[PDB]
Each structure stands twice: as C-alpha cells, then as structure tokens.
C-alpha cells in the first residue's frame with residue numbers, strides 16, 4: 001500500500017531530522033561532556049541504520065529526496081512514486097524540526113536564529129568559513145557517493161540484509177568529512193526542516209541544498225547504473 | 230520455560246544498568262581521557278546489542294518495562310507475561326545499581342546523592358537545565374521511536390538476525406540526542422535502579438520516568454501495529 | 459588440526475594486545491587529538507571483532523584464558539585443549555607487547571615503568587584511585603558478563619554469523635565501564651603481556667588478574683549452562 | 688568485465704582517500720568540536736565498510752595495492768589482474784586528493800605543504816616524533832594483520848556477508864593504534880595521493896609507504912595461506 005510506505009518515509013525522515021539535528025542542537029557543544037561533530041555524525045548514520053532496518057522492508061527506506069530521485073535515475077524506483085515520497089519526507093522532517101524547536105526552547109537562552117538551528121549553509125554560513133565552491137564540490141561528491149553506496153549495497157548480488165549498516169554508516173562517514181564545510185546536507189528534506197525555524201539565511205541558501213544534493217544523487221545513480229551494475 | 234526468560238530479562242537489565250550507568254558514573258567525566266556523553270551513549274546501546282544477541286532468543290530481550298508494554302500494545306507480546314518481565318527487569322536493575330554503588334564507593338569523594346548517581350531528572354535536575362515540557366516531549370518521542378524501531382526491526386519481513394544491531398544502536402542514538410535533557414530514560418527499570426541509591430530528588434521525579442516512557446512505548450507500538458505493519 | 463587453532467589463538471591474542479594496549483600507549487593521551495578511553499575501548503572490541511571473524515571458524519576465537527576456561531566450565535570446550543590455548547594466548551600477547559615496547563621506545567621520553575605500559579592495577583595502581591574491592595567486583599561482574607554474552611551469542615538458537623559483533627562490542631562496552639577502575643583486564647594473557655615490560659608493580663598485582671577474570675569467566679559459563687541454556 | 692572491476696576499484700579508492708584524508712584535513716582539529724584521531728579512524732574504516740558492501744561483489748573491493756598484492760601472495764587473486772587494480776587504485780586516490788585540495792583551499796589559510804595534507808611520514812614527519820624503526824615495525828605489523836583479517840574474513844568457512852564489517856572495522860582499529868606513529872598508511876595508493884599535493888617531504892618519504900605496506904601485506908597473506916587456511 002502506498003499509504004504505509006509514505007507513512008514509513010514520513011516517520012523515517014522525522015527520525016533522521018529529530019536525531020541528527022536533535023543531537024547537534026541539544027548535545028554537540030554541551031560543556032565538557034558534549035558529543036562533538038563525531039557524535040553528531042554517529043547520530044546521523046544511526047537514524048538511517050535504525051529506520052532502514054525498521055521500515056526499509058516497507059518503503060525502501062529513502063528518508064531523503066536525493067535518495068528517491070537518485071534511485072529513480074539509477075533505474076531502481078519508479079517516476080510515479082517520487083513526488084509522494086518527497087512530500088512525505090519533507091513533512092516528516094518539518095514535524096521533527098518543530099518538536100525539536102519546542103524541546104530546545106525549554107532551556108534558557110535558546111535562539112534558533114542566532115545558533116543557526118543546525119541549518120546547512122555556505123560562505124559566511126559554513127561552520128568553518130568555506131567558500132560556495134568548496135560547499136558545492138563536497139556536497140556533490142558526497143551526494144554522489146551516498147547514492148553509489150545505496151545502489152551497490154542493494155544490488156542483486158550484494159549480500160542480503162546488510163544494506164542498512166552500509167547506508168547508515170555511509171551517512172556517519174559523510175558527516176565526519178563535511179560538517180565543517182556545510183554542516184552536511186546530502187538531503188533536501190533535512191535542510192528545509194530546520195531552515196524554516198532558523199528563519200533567515202538558512203531560507204536564503206536553501207535552494208543550494210535542494211539543487212546540489214539532487215544533482216549529486218542523480219550522478220551517483222547514473223554512475224552505478226551505467227558503469228558498475 | 231518462563232523462569233529462564235525471566236532470568237534472561239533479569240541478567241539483561243542488570244547488564245544494561247551496570248554498563249550504561251556504570252560508564253556514566255565511573256568514566257564519562259574522567260579528567261582529560263573520560264568518555265563523555267558520546268561514550269556513555271555508545272555503552273548504552275552496546276548493553277542492549279550484546280544482551281539482545283546473547284539472550285534475545287530466550288526472552289525476546291526487552292530489558293525495559295516500556296519495551297515489554299509497548300510490544301504488548303503492538304500485539305507482539307501477551308498480557309499474561311508482562312508483569313513478570315517488568316519485575317525481573319526492575320530486580321535486575323536494582324542489583325546492578327547496588328554493585329555499581331559499591332564499586333563507585335571505592336574511590337575517595339564518591340557521593341551518590343550529590344552526583345545524582347546517573348539518575349534521570351527534569352527541571353532543576355535536567356543535566357542541561359531543560360524544562361519539564363522539554364523532558365516530556367523528548368522522552369515521549371524517543372520512547373515511541375524506540376518502540377517503532379523494535380517493532381519494525383523484528384517484523385516478519387525484516388531480515389533475520391539484525392534486530393539486535395538496529396535496536397541497540399537505536400539506544401545509542403536515543404542517548405546521543407537526549408542525555409542533556411533528562412539524562413535519557415526511555416526505561417523505567419533504568420530510572421528506578423539508580424534513583425533508589427541517589428535517594429532524594431531522583432525518587433521524587435521517578436513517577437515521570439515510569440509514566441512517560443510507557444505511554445511513549447505504547448504509542449510507538451500502536452503506530453506500527455495500526456499504520457505500518 | 460590443533461596446530462592451526464593454536465596459531466589462530468596466538469595471532470589473535472597478539473592482535474588483541476597489540477591493538478588494545480597499542481592504542482592506549484601510542485594514542486589515548488595524544489595532545490589535543492588523542493583518542494581517550496572511548497577510543498581505547500573501541501580498539502579493544504575491534505581487535506576481537508576483527509579476529510573473531512578472521513579466525514573464529516578455526517579456533518573458536520577465544521584470545522583470552524578466561525574465555526577458554528569459562529567455555530570449559532560452560533560445557534562448550536574440552537578440558538584437554540585448554541592449557542594449549544592458554545599457552546598460545548600468553549605467547550601471542552607477550553610478542554605483541556614486545557613489538558609494542560619497541561615501537562613506543564622510538565619516541566623521546568618513553569618509559570614503560572613510569573607510564574605503567576597500559577598494565578592493569580588496583581589501589582595505588584588503579585587509574586582512578588579505586589580500592590581493591592572496587593577492582594574485584596568490577597572485574598568479576600564484567601568477566602562473568604563477557605562469558606554470558608559469549609555463551610549466548612554462540613548458542614545453537616542464536617542467529618549464525620553475528621557472534622563476532624556481539625562479543626567484540628561487548629569488550630568495548632566492558633572497557634567503557636571499567637578502564638578507570640583497573641584499566642580493564644577481563645583477560646590474563648592481556649595483563650601478563652604488558653606487566654612483564656612494566657616490570658614492577660604490574661608483576662606484583664598480576665595474580666589478581668589471573669584469579670579474578672578466570673573465576674568470573676567460570677561464573678558466567680555456569681550461569682548460562684545452568685540457568686539460561 | 689575487467690573494466691567495471693577497475694571502475695569499482697577506482698571509485699572505491701577515491702571514496703577511501705576522500706573520506707579518510709578528507710575527514711583529517713577538514714574535521715580532525717576543528718576547534719572545540721573537531722573529531723580527533725578517533726573520528727578520523729572511524730571515517731577510515733567506514734570508507735572501506737561502505738564501499739566493500741557497495742562494490743565488493745564487483746571487484747573484490749581491495750581499494751589498496753597492499754591488499755591486491757597480499758591477496759595475490761595468499762593465493763586468492765591472480766597475478767594477471769594485479770597491475771590494473773593498482774593503477775585503478777592510484778588514479779582513484781589522486782582524483783580524490785585533488786577534489787579535496789580544491790575543497791580545502793576554499794578556507795582562508797589552507798596550506799597543503801605546511802599542514803602536511805594528511806601525508807604519511809616518519810621521523811621529523813611522524814605526527815608524534817617516532818623514529819623510522821618505530822614506523823617500520825608498526826606499518827609492517829598492521830599491514831600484515833590487515834591482510835590476515837582480509838584472508839580469514841573471506842575464507843570459505845567464514846560466514847558469508849560480514850567481511851565488509853570485519854575488514855572496514857579492522858582499518859579503524861589500525862588507525863586508532865598508528866596515526867601517531869606514521870599518520871597510518873597500510874596503503875600505497877593512500878600515501879601517494881596526498882603526498883603529490885603536499886609536494887615536499889611527503890614525496891621524499893613515499894617509497895617507505897610503498898615498500899613496507901606491500902611487504903607487510905605479502906607476509907600477512909603468507910601467514911594465512913601457509914599456517915591458518
């Protein structure tokens with residue numbers, strides 16, 4: 001049933017934004033004991049590992065408009081189901097961002113706009129001061145690579161069952177490399193969710209984190225489909 | 230035999246409290262080399278991963294009254310076995326908390342009451358100063374999500390064998406997000422165990438960490454059963 | 459062939475001491491970027507995960523005299539092969555400790571005696587100042603629990619293939635809890651290897667880390683065999 | 688088809704250098720939140736875990752001239768395919784190093800030569816001041832051990848599917864031990880890639896990190912083939 005797959009994609013994407021962004025906003029910078037980028041990166045991949053095992057057998061477990069569209073371009077997913085996944089994914093992420101904003105507001109001094117609310121940005125809004133070109137190349141390469149890993153790990157001849165470990169851990173890796181550059185998107189639903197609550201520059205740069213992750217995912221699906229499969 | 234399943238749940242829950250709380254009390258804040266929240270979060274999920282692989286095939290490996298009751302509500306576990314699991318779980322956790330208190334007392338300056346002995350709390354007793362509403366929402370969402378992941382990872386059509394990785398790592402993730410908010414419960418046996426030895430406010434707020442994790446687990450079982458399965 | 463199993467146990471135990479102790483001596487305290495106890499704990503479990511997958515199908519992959527003897531007591535391993543495993547394990551660990559001492563000496567200021575060379579100790583020689591009773595209880599409980607996890611993860615009805623993940627990660631967990639107490643033994647071959655090169659108090663307390671890990675392993679094998687299996 | 692296997696080895700090795708070196712150059716030392724050696728070590732192993740699951744079923748997933756040649760020496764891979772793998776691997780790594788250098792240049796003050804651009808070195812160029820002998824022994828032992836783990840984890844009687852976890856995590860472990868000594872090579876393609884852009888001493892010491900990782904891999908393949916298999 002399409003409706004359960006959509007529900008799976010919705011809950012899945014909530015889990016991803018709530019855990020990934022949640023761990024950044026609530027836990028990364030906690031004084032002395034905070035989890036850092038490494039811990040945020042771990043949380044990211046675990047959201048996908050845990051939900052891909054929980055609901056992958058229902059929707060395919062994309063939880064990411066760049067995954068859905070890259071699987072489309074890779075010949076693994078039908079055109080007709082794409083938009084519904086992307087919508088489910090966005091809604092899921094917004095609901096998680098909203099519950100997170102509520103949780104974060106329960107601590108004195110919380111300020112979504114000034115902290116950035118874990119939004120992805122480049123230039124002045126890159127966590128490490130990286131240029132827009134730096135942001136483009138990193139997001140493109142890692143979106144491509146994420147898709148190449150998803151395609152291959154779910155290949156016919158790939159050992160059955162492990163895809164959720166491969167894919168989720170691939171997202172940890174992605175974050176271990178790129179947080180300093182863009183705060184790591186590779187996911188338009190993820191960038192949209194928190195940008196809405198950040199409410200300023202995150203909305204002005206949001207288009208970047210629709211365009212680049214998607215193109216990158218497309219490229220990754222094409223590489224697998226035409227050169228590897 | 231019910232007796233071995235109870236024993237499995239008892240040893241399992243001891244392993245969870247001893248490792249999870251043990252790593253927090255003995256190792257989180259160790260000067261210069263201590264493991265932080267990220268390391269506590271890792272320990273948490275590994276207690277469940279390791280025991281779910283060790284004794285999951287005996288009891289189902291709940292190790293958590295919110296898991297048992299959420300599996301009940303999800304239609305995966307019988308009413309008649311619930312109370313015995315919960316009792317086993319509580320006893321297991323108390324024995325671990327007691328052996329831990331003994332281990333911790335062997336270091337000059339240990340003080341269960343003043344340190345909090347890894348107890349879950351909100352408000353004044355949240356590690357990060359988060360309100361009661363912040364604590365409710367986080368514990369509710371993550372208890373629900375823990376149950377959704379348990380249900381899905383053990384679904385008929387979920388690949389056999391991986392559930393312990395999915396579930397245990399889901400608990401790491403849960404801790405990576407919420408330690409700052411409540412010290413992370415999602416488990417009434419876990420909160421009760423150490424609150425007894427903390428012996429003050431942890432006992433006054435303990436009811437919260439029975440009610441919220443259970444309701445949350447219930448909701449998660451209901452979501453899976455009615456919308457996903 | 460017994461000879462290959464011994465060789466597997468020997469190489470295995472070298473891998474464990476070289477990686478576990480190696481990461482502590484070379485990397486834990488590296489200024490600013492060092493890996494801490496959490497990273498040492500991760501290295502520990504990965505030595506066992508990686509070798510249990512590499513040579514578990516040859517020897518059973520014990521790499522630990524407390525594992526061999528606890529599997530004996532659990533009815534999973536024959537008396538007649540025990541001593542040969544323990545010998546293989548000790549030799550393996552000593553060779554790793556020797557190559558490590560050589561590697562560590564290649565940096566100005568290295569001093570095995572004064573640093574402790576990653577040796578296990580209690581009292582004055584506990585990393586965190588914990589008493590002998592604290593050391594006994596922690597080592598006993600965690601040795602028992604390690605054995606309970608090994609027995610269960612390799613149970614007939616335990617899903618085939620995952621034991622190396624369960625067991626190796628159980629050792630990470632063990633280290634996440636107890637490094638501050640004893641530097642974490644649960645392994646007489648591991649304690650002997652480096653105590654020889656530390657060459658002072660580590661040799662005076664070594665008996666503790668033969669007796670306690672073994673008794674603990676025995677207890678864990680007995681718990682599984684009589685109450686769980 | 689040889690061409691796809693080469694492409695798999697090429698993309699694979701790019702993924703390894705881009706993630707491993709990428710995480711070091713972009714994220715290790717990030718102020719306050721940076722990922723450290725432990726996080727770099729995790730990234731390393733995840734590059735191999737993720738690509739071995741994605742393309743292992745295509746090429747065998749070596750991503751490392753020391754792996755290819757050690758599998759040769761172990762009797763697991765034909766002489767005639769070796770050079771093509773090594774070439775693919777080197778090209779892959781250089782392309783990743785180039786895209787990384789471009790990403791890193793987008794931040795004020797980046798200087799590949801002075802930072803070392805994550806190059807492997809010994810002596811004056813060891814991160815921790817370790818001698819050349821220290822560097823030889825560590826790289827030899829860990830290259831050998833990496834190969835022993837690869838051989839065993841892919842043995843006939845090794846449980847099917849887990850090799851990518853065993854091998855990838857073995858690389859994390861390798862890095863947890865040796866970064867301080869050499870920045871961890873065990874991979875000539877990895878050392879060559881960044882040495883080209885470092886452009887000074889990294890090129891003068893590069894031969895070391897061809898010779899030692901290869902000899903070590905050879906030894907590891909020989910140990911398995913003659914003593915364990």
Ligand SMILES: CCCCCCCCO[C@@H]1O[C@H](CO)[C@@H](O)[C@H](O)[C@H]1O
Pocket residue numbers: 090192199200201203204
């Ligand atoms: C699915 C929801 C996507 C939301 C995209 C909306 C883009 C908003 O656009 C932004 O609006 C803000 C006005 O409040 C301003 O801060 C910015 O100048 C403007 O670019």
Ligand SMILES: CCCCCCCCO[C@@H]1O[C@H](CO)[C@@H](O)[C@H](O)[C@H]1O
Pocket residue numbers: 090192203204205206207208210
């Ligand atoms: C699927 C639902 C969301 C679709 C993509 C949202 C793209 C938002 O794009 C944003 O639009 C603004 C225009 O108002 C511009 O001012 C911003 O610069 C741009 O980031």
Ligand SMILES: CCCCCCCCO[C@@H]1O[C@H](CO)[C@@H](O)[C@H](O)[C@H]1O
Pocket residue numbers: 207210211
């Ligand atoms: C899917 C979301 C829209 C993607 C359209 C691709 C081209 C967008 O192009 C960009 O739009 C920005 C404002 O939106 C401007 O600030 C940039 O100058 C413009 O280059």
Ligand SMILES: CCCCCCCCO[C@@H]1O[C@H](CO)[C@@H](O)[C@H](O)[C@H]1O
Pocket residue numbers: 319421428429430432433
């Ligand atoms: C299964 C065991 C559950 C124990 C729940 C008992 C609740 C105790 O209640 C508490 O008792 C303390 C008196 O010692 C006081 O600190 C508190 O004011 C009181 O709320």
Ligand SMILES: CCCCCCCCO[C@@H]1O[C@H](CO)[C@@H](O)[C@H](O)[C@H]1O
Pocket residue numbers: 319421432433434435436437439
């Ligand atoms: C299964 C065994 C334990 C059941 C749940 C214990 C709930 C304890 O609840 C506690 O009770 C006290 C009443 O004395 C109150 O004062 C505290 O505020 C409350 O946290």
Ligand SMILES: CCCCCCCCO[C@@H]1O[C@H](CO)[C@@H](O)[C@H](O)[C@H]1O
Pocket residue numbers: 436439440
């Ligand atoms: C299972 C444990 C009891 C849960 C009962 C749900 C309602 C409890 O309600 C709460 O009890 C606390 C004291 O116990 C009071 O401090 C709070 O004001 C009260 O709201």
Ligand SMILES: CCCCCCCCO[C@@H]1O[C@H](CO)[C@@H](O)[C@H](O)[C@H]1O
Pocket residue numbers: 548650657658659661662
């Ligand atoms: C398998 C190898 C086990 C070695 C155990 C030997 C116990 C050594 O015993 C120790 O010897 C040292 C003398 O050099 C002294 O530092 C100590 O006082 C003494 O207890």
Ligand SMILES: CCCCCCCCO[C@@H]1O[C@H](CO)[C@@H](O)[C@H](O)[C@H]1O
Pocket residue numbers: 548650661662663664665666668
């Ligand atoms: C299997 C090979 C090693 C067997 C166990 C070694 C036990 C060493 O035991 C050591 O012996 C010394 C006696 O000289 C005592 O002085 C020390 O206190 C004690 O730690």
Ligand SMILES: CCCCCCCCO[C@@H]1O[C@H](CO)[C@@H](O)[C@H](O)[C@H]1O
Pocket residue numbers: 665668669
């Ligand atoms: C297997 C290694 C020997 C274990 C024997 C168990 C009893 C050892 O007993 C201990 O031996 C130590 C010196 O060895 C003394 O310092 C202690 O006082 C003594 O209690």
Ligand SMILES: CCCCCCCCO[C@@H]1O[C@H](CO)[C@@H](O)[C@H](O)[C@H]1O
Pocket residue numbers: 777879886887888890891
């Ligand atoms: C596959 C590509 C391998 C490149 C190996 C080339 C070895 C370069 O050699 C180096 O060249 C530099 C001149 O630019 C100098 O810094 C060094 O003195 C010299 O050793």
Ligand SMILES: CCCCCCCCO[C@@H]1O[C@H](CO)[C@@H](O)[C@H](O)[C@H]1O
Pocket residue numbers: 777879890891892893894895897
């Ligand atoms: C497969 C393509 C690369 C082959 C190995 C490159 C080995 C480079 O070796 C380098 O060569 C230089 C000679 O110019 C010496 O000066 C350096 O000391 C040495 O590191």
Ligand SMILES: CCCCCCCCO[C@@H]1O[C@H](CO)[C@@H](O)[C@H](O)[C@H]1O
Pocket residue numbers: 894897898
């Ligand atoms: C595959 C790359 C070449 C390996 C050849 C093995 C012997 C190299 O030998 C070394 O070469 C270096 C310059 O290249 C010199 O600095 C050293 O003194 C020399 O020992």
